[PDB]
Structures are given as C-alpha cells and as structure tokens.
Design a binder for this molecule. Structure first.
Ligand SMILES: [Cl-]
Ligand SMILES: [Cl-]
Ligand SMILES: [Cu+2]
Ligand SMILES: [Cu+2]
Ligand SMILES: [Cu+2]
Ligand SMILES: [Cu+2]
Lengths: 235, 235
C-alpha cells in the first residue's frame, strides 16, 4: 500500500536557482532554515532516462514526491552507516535494490544510510519534488540545509533558458560522483557499481518508511516564507 | 557450470582499427569473410564502469570471451524476434535479466534476439573479446560481416594514441543508440530502459547456450588470414 501526500509547495525566490544536474534533472532549487530545522527543496522535471545512479546519504533524510507517478525508484532494505565502506565488488559488497513504480502524489521517505536512486523509464518528461532535510550529524553549510543545494550548485551548470539547456559534460558527470563525499553522499558513477540485484517485489519494511511530521513542518516553513514571514529564511 | 575456450586470436591488420566506442570500450576491431562465413571480431579493453547498455541483435550471433573474468554480463531467457517491438514501458514491456560473473577464459554464447549487455564492475581495466557472426537474414554490408564493425566505425571516434583517448561526446552516445537499428541492433540509451529485474540466479537454459562449431571455424579463418592465406579476407 502506498503513502500519499497532497501538496509540497516551492519557496518563491526573487531569482530562482535553476540547475541542470549531471544526472539529467531540471531543478528549481532553494534552501530554507528556521530555528528548529534546515533543508533544501527542489521541484524538478525529469526527461526520459533521467535520474541519479544509486547513492547513499550521510548528512540528510530524503523525501520523493511524484505528482504524476511514472517515476521508478530503487531502494534497499540494507543500511550503510559507514561512509568509509563503499558497497563495491572490492570491499563491503554490492547491495540488493527493490523497485517502486510510483503513483500520482505518492510520497516516498528515505532515511540516511539507505541506498536509493530513480529513473524516468517513460518516453515523456515527468515532475518530481525532493526535500532533503539536514540531519543531526550534518556539518553546518553556508545555507544551513545539510549540504544538498550546495552540492547541486557546485556540480551542475546553471540554467538560463529552459528551452536551451546547458550541454552536460564529462567533467560534470565525473564531478557529480567525485565531489559527492564532501556533501555527505556516496554517489555511484554507473548504475551497477553498487548494485547486485534489482527486484520488483517490494518489501513491506521499505513501503512503511514514513516521516510526515518533519515534512509538514518544512511545508509550514515554506508557506510562511512565501507569506513574507521573516522568522524563516529561504534563498 | 561454465563453458570455457582457450584461444580466440586477433586478425593482424597492417593498420589496426582502434575505436573508442561510446559505451566506453577500447576496441581493436576487424572484419573477416570466407566463402562460407562472415564476421567481425574485437579484442577490447574495458575500463572500470565500461560496457554497453542492454541491447538486442537481429543481424548477428555474439560470443563473449573473458580472458581474466571480472566482467559481469547480463542476459535474458526471453527472446525478442520482432525488431519493431521494443521491450519498453509503453509497448512490448521490459524484460528480466540474469547476471553472470565471468571467469577467466569463460566463453558466453548469445544468439540473435536475446537481450544482453555487460559492465566492468571492478576498479581495474579488463580484457574481453567479441565475435559477431553474420546470420542468415543479415543484409550484405561493405565488409560482409553482418554489420557490427561498420556500426562501431560509424558511431565511435577512431583512436590515435591509447594513452590519450578521444573524449566521448553526447552526440556519440546518442548516436550509439539512435544509429543502432540500421545495423540490426535495438540499443537502449540507459541501463533500465529495457529492464524490469536483474537477478543473480542464472537459469540453466542460458548457461547451456553454446556454438563452438561456428567459433572454431572463425578461428580457422583468422589463423589462415594471419598465415597469409588469400582464400580468406580480413581488413
Ligand atoms: Cl559484490
Ligand atoms: Cl514494463
Ligand atoms: Cu501512509
Ligand atoms: Cu538521494
Ligand atoms: Cu561447455
Ligand atoms: Cu551485443
């Protein structure tokens, strides 16, 4: 059974940060913080075939929200609490992944240390929204968001015109993987690097992952920011 | 149980055709024909992470020979006899793949219509040898080999210096997928395009695939060519 969510609004910044990530994702991204919480959020468009290779977070917890479904996510049952141990053939070993064919407005919650990724397997561009919440061990980044917006900003070209995207380069793709550990991500550079099997039978243990409480709080922050409330910041 | 083979020699051409394929493979490639048979052969080096996305052949039967193992192959049980039907989410449906952790000198045989691919999942460059034999429905290509050398030559940059490789480009990667049908290949442009599941339990039906008779014949052709025999041609 799926977990759903009705609305995750976007912080409306004066000059929107639009980034074409080296995973082939069109991001409208921002960071927000409040006294109690810090996070990055992106409303994204995923072209056919787009999406990041399997990766693991150490500084954030992630939410995926798929307003139109279509997106296929991949998720482990196994957790990788040690950033020093890559799940690779020569070391800690590659992991098993389970796929999720997302449904309209499905909300998927993925705590730090789980391996995940996703792809647009369809022939049309699909929307997706991410929230990356700063966890309790994350270092303080300039935007106090746990590091994710700084990551994308550092590795992906900035977009001017959505109808004339930057050409992603080899260096950008390599940097997307190699710069990732400084932002608390172990990011694979090809699909099967960290991967042993992909299975379509979803374990209940993954399906049940949920953190609505933190998400509703961050929505409050976003909506307050959009109302002009000065006790929160988004930029 | 694995099928092994001791030696697949390379046709020694005056000026070797070295191609850096857009799948990140370093090819030393040639075509050979004789009265009875026609084929392309490549001795290749696969950098970490290199290898083609899942694809299906219509003009050739393929052999993979892994002198040092390490290479991980992916192979279906299902066959796709209709080139007009792509195994995609909007159409004929994505297929199940089974992985093979190759062993030194293992020989894997893959008849037309099967879906396959492979990757170097290790942190070192690994050798691999391919033979693509012209089947009975293949159109006549300029080298009478069933189309594969013409394909790689058309879509991949030619190498000058193995220590200073060409930079693969976006257009080359796109062309590797989009030009493929003219060479009798349905080639996916990302790993999960044609793929539903990847499983590590190999069905006996795939393991048993074998065509040593045709391979030994093509080795004869190669060895004759290298002895200067004029009744066969390699170039
Ligand atoms: Cl492994
Ligand atoms: Cl499907
Ligand atoms: Cu629920
Ligand atoms: Cu993530
Ligand atoms: Cu055998
Ligand atoms: Cu092939």
């Amino acid at each position: 059974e799926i977990h759903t969510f009705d609305d995750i609004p976007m912080p409306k910044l004066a000059d929107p940060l639009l980034i074409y990530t080296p995973a082939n994702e069109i991001f409208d991204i921002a960071s927000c913080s409040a006294k109690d919480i810090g996070f990055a959020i992106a409303h994204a468009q995923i072209p056919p075939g787009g999406g990041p290779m399997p990766h693991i977070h150490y500084f954030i917890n992630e939410w995926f929200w798929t307003p139109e479904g279509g997106i296929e996510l991949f998720h482990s049952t196994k957790q990788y609490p040690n950033m020093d141990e890559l799940p690779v053939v020569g070391g800690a070993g590659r992991g098993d992944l389970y796929s999720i064919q997302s449904e309209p407005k499905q909300l998927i919650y993925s705590p730090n240390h789980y391996m995940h990724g996703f792809v647009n397997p369809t022939d049309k561009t699909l929307p997706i929204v991410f929230v990356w919440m700063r966890n309790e061990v994350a270092p303080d980044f300039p935007y106090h968001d746990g590091g994710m917006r700084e990551y994308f900003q550092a590795v992906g070209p900035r977009i001017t015109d959505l109808n004339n995207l930057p050409e992603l380069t080899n260096a950008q793709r390599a940097a997307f993987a190699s710069e990732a550990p400084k932002y608390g991500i172990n990011q694979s550079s090809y699909f099967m690097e960290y991967v042993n099997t992909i299975s379509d039978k979803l374990p209940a243990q993954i399906a049940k992952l949920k953190n609505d409480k933190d998400l509703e709080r961050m929505v409050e922050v976003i909506e307050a920011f959009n109302r002009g409330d000065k006790s929160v910041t988004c930029s």
